[PDB]
Amino acid sequence: IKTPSPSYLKGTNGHAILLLHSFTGTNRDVKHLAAELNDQGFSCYAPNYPGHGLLLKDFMTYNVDDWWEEVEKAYQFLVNEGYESISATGVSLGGLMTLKLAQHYPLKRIAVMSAPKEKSDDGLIEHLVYYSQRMSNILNLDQQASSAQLAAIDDYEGEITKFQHFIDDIMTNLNVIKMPANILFGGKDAPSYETSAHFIYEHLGSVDKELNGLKDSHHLMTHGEGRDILEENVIRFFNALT
Ligand SMILES: [Cl-]
Ligand SMILES: [Mg+2]
Ligand SMILES: [Mg+2]
């Protein structure tokens, strides 16, 4: 049980793309999309947020400051490798990280999948419970081990509040994002993600921006139904760099 190492695909076209994963996910959320972009010539870097991949109690000793710091380090890695063209994409939390990156750095373009404009305490807790349940079954943890992981959720309340403020701060400042942008959501995701996507699209400062609601995509747009259409759309968007 460990947090995965980052995934760096070297390409040939001189353009680099950061790919950022979901809350409680890992970079396996973006593996296929990264590889497909690299097959088109891009360099791709998919970091893993600290804490992710660990059992729930350990996971909850990291927070949004740690996850953002890793994103900053990933961007700096690409700068230090010599890339002059750096772009970003991500799903859910990774979409939020992409927007925050765009507020900090001269990204060439961004593609944001399934970003929320707010999250409730109950919604975040439910995601932690699902993560803990899935981890325990994969690891075949016994009754007592699995039960203790869920016991620790109450002490994460302050970090949930921090996560909510992190979202709010990004959403308040979308007007500062001005590079070309592609905002995507899935028609088989909850309605709130369509509402969120419209809000994000409308508040971006970018002159060149598009909104794509893909009817057969689910929340994790990179996986499952609709994936070929999602990838075609995202790859076409980044191919405008070439
Ligand atoms: Cl999220
Ligand atoms: Mg292919
Ligand atoms: Mg609609």
CSV table of N, CA and C in Angstrom, one decimal, residues 114 185-189 213-227 229-230:
chain,number,residue,atom,x,y,z
A,114,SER,N,-15.7,17.7,-15.5
A,114,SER,CA,-16.5,17.4,-14.3
A,114,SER,C,-16.1,18.2,-13.0
A,185,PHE,N,-18.5,18.3,-19.3
A,185,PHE,CA,-19.3,17.6,-18.3
A,185,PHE,C,-20.0,16.4,-19.0
A,186,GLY,N,-20.4,15.5,-18.2
A,186,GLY,CA,-21.1,14.3,-18.7
A,186,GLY,C,-22.6,14.3,-18.5
A,187,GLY,N,-23.3,14.0,-19.5
A,187,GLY,CA,-24.8,13.9,-19.5
A,187,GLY,C,-25.3,12.9,-18.5
A,188,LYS,N,-24.5,11.9,-18.2
A,188,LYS,CA,-24.9,10.8,-17.2
A,188,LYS,C,-24.3,11.1,-15.8
A,189,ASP,N,-23.7,12.3,-15.6
A,189,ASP,CA,-23.4,12.7,-14.3
A,189,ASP,C,-24.6,13.4,-13.7
A,213,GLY,N,-21.0,19.3,-23.2
A,213,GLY,CA,-21.7,18.3,-22.5
A,213,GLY,C,-21.9,17.0,-23.3
A,214,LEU,N,-21.2,16.0,-22.9
A,214,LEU,CA,-21.1,14.8,-23.7
A,214,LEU,C,-22.2,13.8,-23.1
A,215,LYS,N,-23.2,13.5,-23.9
A,215,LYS,CA,-24.4,12.9,-23.4
A,215,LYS,C,-24.2,11.5,-22.7
A,216,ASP,N,-23.2,10.7,-23.2
A,216,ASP,CA,-23.1,9.4,-22.6
A,216,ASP,C,-21.9,9.3,-21.6
A,217,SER,N,-21.3,10.4,-21.3
A,217,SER,CA,-20.2,10.3,-20.3
A,217,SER,C,-20.8,10.4,-18.9
A,218,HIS,N,-20.1,9.7,-18.0
A,218,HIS,CA,-20.4,9.7,-16.5
A,218,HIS,C,-19.4,10.7,-15.9
A,219,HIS,N,-19.5,10.8,-14.5
A,219,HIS,CA,-18.7,11.7,-13.8
A,219,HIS,C,-17.2,11.6,-14.1
A,220,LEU,N,-16.7,10.4,-14.0
A,220,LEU,CA,-15.3,10.1,-14.3
A,220,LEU,C,-15.2,9.9,-15.8
A,221,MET,N,-15.2,11.1,-16.5
A,221,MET,CA,-15.3,11.1,-18.0
A,221,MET,C,-14.3,10.3,-18.7
A,222,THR,N,-13.1,10.1,-18.1
A,222,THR,CA,-12.0,9.4,-18.7
A,222,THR,C,-12.2,7.9,-18.7
A,223,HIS,N,-13.2,7.4,-18.0
A,223,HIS,CA,-13.4,5.9,-17.9
A,223,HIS,C,-14.8,5.5,-18.4
A,224,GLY,N,-14.9,4.4,-19.0
A,224,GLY,CA,-16.2,3.8,-19.2
A,224,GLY,C,-16.9,4.3,-20.5
A,225,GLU,N,-18.2,4.3,-20.4
A,225,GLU,CA,-19.1,4.7,-21.5
A,225,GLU,C,-18.7,6.1,-22.0
A,226,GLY,N,-18.7,6.3,-23.3
A,226,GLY,CA,-18.4,7.6,-23.9
A,226,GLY,C,-17.0,7.9,-24.0
A,227,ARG,N,-16.0,7.1,-23.6
A,227,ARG,CA,-14.6,7.5,-23.5
A,227,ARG,C,-14.1,7.8,-24.8
A,229,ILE,N,-15.5,9.2,-27.4
A,229,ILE,CA,-15.9,10.6,-27.8
A,229,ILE,C,-15.2,11.6,-26.9
A,230,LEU,N,-15.1,11.3,-25.6
A,230,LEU,CA,-14.3,12.3,-24.7
A,230,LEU,C,-12.9,12.4,-25.2
